[PDB]
């Protein structure tokens with residue numbers, strides 16, 4: 001029993017982290033096979049960062065403008081290209097610790113683990129949700145760029161995030177591993193603000209199902225709701241609308257608990273209108289939205305505490 005924000009084991013990812021220096025800027029890179037990936041703003045100076053032209057800044061560099069270090073061992077750069085907001089550095093050694101892996105662009109509301117790294121050295125692991133407004137509420141200091149987010153399925157690492165910047169509100173923005181940003185953000189020190197965010201309705205429901213699987217039913221009720229009547233309540237409390245696709249996705253959790261999705265929505269509707277009355281759900285005094293339905297099935301017992 002119990003329920004925690006759980007990251008994936010980070011070992012397979014730790015063996016891919018390196019340090020990338022160019023000029024005076026240093027950040028982390030990701031070494032798969034004979035390529036190292038890292039944010040392209042590694043080629044900026046302090047004055048470049050306000051309005052960089054990366055194409056112009058890059059052509060002024062050679063292969064040996066870039067210093068790549070894997071632990072102790074220096075790695076020789078023998079090629080370089082810019083892919084969207086990333087640089088791809090070809091090196092002369094293929095990483096013997098390369099795991100099976102894919103590059104994936106995750107969807108809003110999905111979760112992943114972040115390995116926070118400094119100077120190519122892993123420092124910490126934690127779980128994140130891609131917010132609706134395409135930021136993540138991470139914990140990143142200077143030098144954390146090039147840290148990656150990932151999921152692990154069996155033995156395959158699905159890389160989905162690389163860290164580039166922090167917004168004025170203290171949340172974080174970055175790209176997939178093809179260099180396309182999540183959200184309308186650009187890699188410049190310009191005025192950039194997070195769009196307004198929304199609570200991830202699908203995840204709140206998934207976590208209510210977690211609470212039932214772990215043996216708690218106090219928040220349920222005898223009512224039910226139409227999709228549309230729920231969405232009128234979702235609107236008032238700044239929750240995402242529930243769609244029929246979201247109802248379908250909650251199918252298995254509804255089966256394992258015997259609670260119909262729209263029954264659970266009535267429960268949530270009532271929770272949004274009346275509060276929690278000083279009680280907790282799975283240890284929390286607030287409604288949690290950073291667990292997907294997949295998160296719940298992964299972590300919870302497949303047998304309900306009836």
Ligand SMILES: CC(C)C[C@H](NC(=O)/C=C/c1ccccc1)C(=O)N[C@H](C=O)C[C@@H]1CCCNC1=O
Nearest residue numbers: 041049140141142143144145164165166187188189
């Ligand atoms: C987009 C790029 C041109 C540079 C990038 N810029 C930024 O992250 C923006 C920082 C900022 C702070 C306050 C107000 C407005 C902007 C950067 O330094 N990125 C760091 C990468 O190493 C990581 C930043 C550092 C700050 C502290 N936390 C973080 O995530």
